RNA sequence: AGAAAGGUGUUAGUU
């Protein structure tokens, strides 16, 4: 599963660079941070070093929020920028949806996607997605769809109602 | 006229001799109505080539 | 007869049919392009591209 | 759409909206009071296209049942019959 | 179907 990781590092009084990125484990996070730093300020991986790698939890994991995520796509042309909003209860939860969505619609891989910034939009007016606004209606009430539910050859036909 | 040419093209629609027959037939049908090097010449020929008052009285 | 016999006869649902045909022309062109096949498809595509 | 709900009796048993039938397209009827709340719960754009037709079809049938007049110069059935008669 | 460009076919976004 994905996990938020805060990576702080600097080249061997050089400035300390700290950033939040999402990785399955620490080793992926540190390599990802180095690759991000390599293309930003041009710091060699061999020369630099990591001073702190910390895991970040969700301060309010049982509260529904809306997360706006800005990312950079690599496509056939390899240049694209989008912004998408997800409603869930964790920053890492939305990121998994973001990765799952883009690998679905746009046939993406984890390496070609880099998170530019993730923010928590707490204003309903700031939401730019019709689905998010509809889900935030005060009268949200809908029947559960796509239910469909060993012991093969059941005795009576399913009620399914 | 352009539609008539398209209609004529629609009506029109060894290998050197076979294309020569095709070159003749395609142009002759237009005249009646009115390998890569060989195909280039065939395209060149096509490229270069390309009452109411009385009835109402 | 003589001169504009048709015009003289007319003077002495066409609009509705013409309007219906014009309205259906937008859908007919898209359907014809999608259903076109063979050499005629290339000719239709070339004509649409030129237009 | 997330919710594309719209509007004798309105009994909606087995999707038949007998006052008529609605089995052809999955849209709900719900017989909400005098109206029939023809709901769509996260369906498809085809359902949105059908409801606009269904709403007019149900209204035309209701209008025809109450007073179909003649309109010489059954709603769709009468118009198709008139077109067939004209042809 | 599936293992140059057209489409009043569709779904997510940019200006």
Curated annotation (Swiss-Prot), chain A:
Keyword hit for Plastid: no
GO biological process, one term: cytoplasmic translation
InterPro entries: Ribosomal_eL20, Ribosomal_eL20_dom, Ribosomal_eL20_eukaryotes
Top-level taxon: Eukaryota
One Gene Ontology term, aspect cellular component: preribosome
Location in or out of the cell: Cytoplasm
Principal localisation: cytoplasm
Transmembrane is among the record's keywords: no
Gene3D superfamilies xrefs: 3.10.20.10
GO molecular function terms noted in the UniProt entry: structural constituent of ribosome
Keyword annotations of the record: Cytoplasm, Ribonucleoprotein, Ribosomal protein
Role summary: Component of the ribosome, a large ribonucleoprotein complex responsible for the synthesis of proteins in the cell. The small ribosomal subunit (SSU) binds messenger RNAs (mRNAs) and translates the encoded message by selecting cognate aminoacyl-transfer RNA (tRNA) molecules. The large subunit (LSU) contains the ribosomal catalytic site termed the peptidyl transferase center (PTC), which catalyzes the formation of peptide bonds, thereby polymerizing the amino acids delivered by tRNAs into a polypeptide chain.
Family statement drawn from the similarity comment of this UniProt entry: Belongs to the eukaryotic ribosomal protein eL20 family.
HAMAP family: Ribosomal_eL20
Miscellaneous field: There are 2 genes for eL20 in S.pombe.
Protein name as annotated: Large ribosomal subunit protein eL20A
Curated annotation (Swiss-Prot), chain B:
Sequence similarity: Belongs to the TRAFAC class OBG-HflX-like GTPase superfamily. OBG GTPase family. NOG subfamily.
Function noted in UniProt: Involved in the biogenesis of the 60S ribosomal subunit.
Protein name: Probable nucleolar GTP-binding protein 1
Boundaries of the shown chain within the full protein: 15 to 161 of 642
Species of origin: Schizosaccharomyces pombe (strain 972 / ATCC 24843)
Cellular location(s): Nucleus, Nucleolus
UniProtKB/Swiss-Prot annotation, chain C:
Region annotation (Disordered) ranges: 1-28
Compositional bias annotation for Basic residues: 12-22
Domain of life: Eukaryota
Localization terms from the record: Nucleus, Nucleolus
Functional description taken from the UniProt entry: Involved in the biogenesis of the 60S ribosomal subunit. May play a part in the quality control of pre-60S particles.
Subunit structure: Component of the pre-66S ribosomal particle. Interacts with ppp1/nop7 and nop52/rrp1. Interacts with rsa4 (via WD repeats).
Family, per entry: Belongs to the eukaryotic ribosomal protein eS8 family. Ribosome biogenesis protein NSA2 subfamily.
The name this protein goes by in its record: Ribosome biogenesis protein nsa2
Lineage: Eukaryota, Fungi, Dikarya, Ascomycota, Taphrinomycotina
Gene name per UniProt: nsa2
UniProtKB/Swiss-Prot annotation, chain D:
Domain of life: Eukaryota
Location(s) in or outside the cell: Cytoplasm; Nucleus
Protein family membership: Belongs to the universal ribosomal protein uL6 family.
Known function: Component of the ribosome, a large ribonucleoprotein complex responsible for the synthesis of proteins in the cell. The small ribosomal subunit (SSU) binds messenger RNAs (mRNAs) and translates the encoded message by selecting cognate aminoacyl-transfer RNA (tRNA) molecules. The large subunit (LSU) contains the ribosomal catalytic site termed the peptidyl transferase center (PTC), which catalyzes the formation of peptide bonds, thereby polymerizing the amino acids delivered by tRNAs into a polypeptide chain.
Quaternary structure note: Component of the large ribosomal subunit (LSU). Mature yeast ribosomes consist of a small (40S) and a large (60S) subunit. The 40S small subunit contains 1 molecule of ribosomal RNA (18S rRNA) and at least 33 different proteins. The large 60S subunit contains 3 rRNA molecules (25S, 5.8S and 5S rRNA) and at least 46 different proteins. uL6 lines the binding pocket for eukaryotic elongation factor 2 (eEF2).
Misc. remarks from the entry: There are 2 genes for uL6 in S.pombe.
Protein name: Large ribosomal subunit protein uL6A
Species for this entry: Schizosaccharomyces pombe (strain 972 / ATCC 24843)
From-to range in the entire protein, with total length: 4 to 161 of 190
